[PDB]
Design a protein around this ligand. Sequence first.
Ligand SMILES: CC(C)CCC[C@@H](C)[C@H]1CC[C@H]2[C@@H]3CC=C4C[C@@H](OC(=O)CCC(=O)O)CC[C@]4(C)[C@H]3CC[C@]12C
Ligand SMILES: Nc1ncnc2c1ncn2[C@@H]1O[C@H](COP(=O)(O)OP(=O)(O)OP(=O)(O)O)[C@@H](O)[C@H]1O
Ligand SMILES: Nc1ncnc2c1ncn2[C@@H]1O[C@H](COP(=O)(O)OP(=O)(O)O)[C@@H](O)[C@H]1O
Ligand SMILES: CC1(C)Oc2ccc(C#N)cc2[C@@H](N2CCCC2=O)[C@@H]1O
Ligand SMILES: [Mg+2]
Ligand SMILES: [Mg+2]
Length: 1145
Amino acid sequence: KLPIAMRAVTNYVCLKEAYEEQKKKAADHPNRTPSIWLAMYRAFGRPILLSSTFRYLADLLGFAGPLCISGIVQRVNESKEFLENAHVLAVLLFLALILQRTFLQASYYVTIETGINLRGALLAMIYNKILRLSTSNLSMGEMTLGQINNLVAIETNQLMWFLFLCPNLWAMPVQIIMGVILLYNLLGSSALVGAAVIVLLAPIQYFIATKLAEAQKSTLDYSTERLKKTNEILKGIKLLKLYAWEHIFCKSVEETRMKELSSLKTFALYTSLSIFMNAAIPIAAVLATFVTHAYASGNNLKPAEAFASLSLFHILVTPLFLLSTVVRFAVKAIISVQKLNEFLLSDEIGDVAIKVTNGYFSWGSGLATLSNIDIRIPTGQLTMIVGQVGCGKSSLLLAILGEMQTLEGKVYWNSRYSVAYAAQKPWLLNATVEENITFGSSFNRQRYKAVTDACSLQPDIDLLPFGDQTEIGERGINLSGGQRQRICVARALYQNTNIVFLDDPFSALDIHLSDHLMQEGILKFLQDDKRTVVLVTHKLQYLTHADWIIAMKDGSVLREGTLKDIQTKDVELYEHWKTLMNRWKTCWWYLTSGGFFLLFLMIFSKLLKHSVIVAIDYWLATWTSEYQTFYVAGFSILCGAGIFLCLVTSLTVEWMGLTAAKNLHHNLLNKIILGPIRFFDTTPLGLILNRFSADTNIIDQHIPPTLESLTRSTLLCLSAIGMISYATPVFLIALAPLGVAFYFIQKYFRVASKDLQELDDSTQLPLLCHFSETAEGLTTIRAFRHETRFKQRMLELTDTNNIAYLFLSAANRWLEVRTDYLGACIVLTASIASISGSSNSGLVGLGLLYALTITNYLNWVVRNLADLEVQMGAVKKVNSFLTMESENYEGTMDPSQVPEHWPQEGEIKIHDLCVRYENNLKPVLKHVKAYIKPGQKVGICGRTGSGKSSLSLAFFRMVDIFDGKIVIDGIDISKLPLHTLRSRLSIILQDPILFSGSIRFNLDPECKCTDDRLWEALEIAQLKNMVKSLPGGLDATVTEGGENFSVGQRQLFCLARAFVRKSSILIMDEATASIDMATENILQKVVMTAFADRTVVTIAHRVHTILTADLVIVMKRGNILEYDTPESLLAQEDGVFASFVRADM
Ligand SMILES: CC(C)CCC[C@@H](C)[C@H]1CC[C@H]2[C@@H]3CC=C4C[C@@H](OC(=O)CCC(=O)O)CC[C@]4(C)[C@H]3CC[C@]12C
Ligand SMILES: Nc1ncnc2c1ncn2[C@@H]1O[C@H](COP(=O)(O)OP(=O)(O)OP(=O)(O)O)[C@@H](O)[C@H]1O
Ligand SMILES: Nc1ncnc2c1ncn2[C@@H]1O[C@H](COP(=O)(O)OP(=O)(O)O)[C@@H](O)[C@H]1O
Ligand SMILES: CC1(C)Oc2ccc(C#N)cc2[C@@H](N2CCCC2=O)[C@@H]1O
Ligand SMILES: [Mg+2]
Ligand SMILES: [Mg+2]
């Protein structure tokens, strides 16, 4: 499989020991952080020393070119002592070249091996950190799941790619210095003038690296923010599309994209300037050197010395080809490792089954949310926790589990035992249903059947494509909320632990499913195993079954004991409870996106640049062919034109890249956000967010540099071929076999590369997904204490990905070795042809040194072409989304007919409405006919899967209608533009989607509302006091996903978000699912007293709420059964509504 040295386990252990030694060294000092760079050096240095040794030997052998060219030229110009023989020197040059290529490839192999080992070790380190970091980092905005995913995907790979190129940073300097030292021998003091111009690259490149570092840090910041906004959009597309807020968030994302593109333009300008200097300081150095020699040494250059010096200049230029690449990658890797080091230095976690005494706990801030927690959980009994929204129940659970730092008090666990946690926000991995329910336990069909029948999952799973073996979660078929929650509770029940913490498992479930889970699942199945159970529920009707009762108010336990104990001590609380219960082509498109003028300007400028650059060498050959003002003047004008064209060609390609990136991302976003909701339901969010993050990163930052390096290399190779063939017209014949050979090796490479490439992208996706599903749901993994198994799985997956990437790199090295030997053969053939069949004593030299150039740059041509193919793949992925269906916003009703206040009355008539989600699917709604008067209170009830939500989303045309007319105030909604319909009606969904920013930003993203109405709304939604007490008032922050607030408070914010709009029709779809009964009653009273004029349709979670409603509808499999007042339906014998009321009460 993977050799032991290359396993992620050993590399991780080595890097971890190095980093722990660094942490010791840091503990030695105050304000001296541990450094990843020294840890990595100490751990993985010896391989890098080996590769550096190979590189130095390669450079020393590369200096054989100058000597051999000098000898060959001198001999063409004019035993065993025949080593001067031209052919002998040519053969020695060929052998030196093959040996240099062997050493270079050995160095590359060692470096890539080390880079892959280090990538594995770093991913292991940050994965263990994920398993260690406290959730208060994500809850308070310290960081986000997206940032951690960015670490795993972009930043670690950026460090790895830099480490591939690392030996250059110290090898390129040396190779340059040696060159100067040799030039000085041939040319005397004149060569010191060129040495100064070359030395100036060090200050210049350091300055440019400073500027690039600043620009890259800014780009990374704005990329983080833009991806945050994009992810929040994609996750909440339903709410945005329902509120007509799509374009507002699109505009904000575009603003952040503009800032990111300004930072990218600074980075491109300074990258384009570094390329200009690396190219034009050699032109200037050649000028200075040879002009000075012309006017200092009276003796002219003999051809041998001239060509030796020119070859030394070529050997200097080769280092500077890759200097821009290495400075770019080093500047990116420095930022990357700053981010990694910030991540790895963060906050980390610190009878009677559980006994908490005098416990003050806080959510990683400094102010206590729980105080005076004196509780005990009796062993093997049912403990129920009851409290209004935001009273510390989930806080209490995650405190016992130790997930929030303790300020005072103790918890005793008569080290922690494995506790089965069913979190309030259910978490599902990307495995099958069976894997999520078993969750790392031996399959037992008897227990599995018992659990599945206690959670009523059987009818729901047999409706799935592959019953019980269908992939679930992100990247798989998306289950409804109730299905996901019941799968999570099934997971909790199936495990063989003794303590089961269930945090409100009945939020999404209806009355029948909830009662079934309570009777068969908790009271019967768990009490048979005699397992401790802690329930956090608002279902007060279940308090009769409770064995122990904890009551929580305002963060502190108000009273604790059996029901009778509470009745005897706190008569008030018991009476309150009783009252409440009432008892390719893509490449051409990328090039053309410039506009047919940037492309042709680029290509013509590059060709002219190389024409002049090669004319410089031809001119030097002709000039030194003597053994003057005219030659100096011609040389100067050629060099100046070369510098100018270098500047132009540098700018053009980067500008092309900028424009292409901007247009690609803009089209992608403005087409994704206009798609139908069916597209987002069907397509996994991963397949879209990856386009937005990884493919966008490639398009922005990876394609322009690869393309420019490819063009430079290919034109250097073509220039060398042209010069050689001109010097020796016979070489063209020799170009027939070799060229053909090229075409073959590449061919073979492809049929493997492609294959391996697919593998390397199919084995990386699991790994990344793991880092996701552990970053999310971390508290669950640490509640079951399955951290060891997840570490093992991460090591396995990273080993697999490393095997795949190692084979990919091995194929690349195969092709590179083959092309290097082909280039050595090209050099040999050109050398022989020039020695034997060239006219002048100067053309032999040009042919030889340009053959050397061919060998030097053909390798880069091949490598960069392969990389550019793999990246045009990503451009193809991004372009694929411009063929989406676009929701029809146009509308047909003339805007003149639509009044200025269209829902002015709020009377809805639904005539023969039949709704389906996709064509050739079951009609969820069947010939429903409804008539709600203006200013009428309508309550719709039914069992899960009865089309309540379909009937709700019908008004906003998020479900495709087969037949039926929905007339709101005399207008068929089918004619209106989508926005005038979706903006003038307000709907409160069941899932509390919440965006990052202030409270204001979540209540009115347009900022078109005064603070007074925001306070009115937050008063109706019962959140006025909590916001008044919050640090920043209405400007208080809301971290991504609303994690810093309770679930109930998230829902109440979602209710205020609807109350602000103040439209005439309010569709409340199970809005009080997570709200407790105490808050829910007062909230309903206030909403009825405030919206008494408007028309509200309430799809109710409990029938008690819709008892005081003007009209009641009961749905059953898409059919309205009873249509009358609640009194009539109650008085009907054996009626459905009457049965609902008994169960709910
Ligand atoms: C000119 C000849 C003799 C050698 C060609 C390369 C070298 C000049 C070396 C010596 C100094 C090196 C540069 C000096 C330091 C930096 C900055 C470094 O990034 C940072 O320093 C962080 C940014 C910051 O300081 O805020 C990235 C590598 C780089 C460009 C180095 C790249 C390789 C350089 C140019
Ligand atoms: N992840 C979190 N990070 C920081 N503060 C939090 C977090 N969750 C809740 N809080 C704060 O803790 C207080 C208690 O909320 P908690 O999380 O215990 O809700 P809960 O009572 O379990 O929820 P509900 O009963 O509505 O389902 C709230 O004021 C909230 O501000
Ligand atoms: N996103 C969806 N795409 C296709 N069909 C769905 C989707 N959601 C629900 N359904 C189907 O429509 C029917 C009614 O679902 P729904 O309207 O969600 O019921 P409820 O009113 O209880 O929410 C169900 O039988 C279900 O199979
Ligand atoms: C004028 C010369 C000495 O200086 C430069 C400057 C920039 C670049 C580039 N890229 C290349 C070169 C030399 N060439 C031209 C073809 C191969 C090579 O090394 C030039 O012969
Ligand atoms: Mg809760
Ligand atoms: Mg529903």
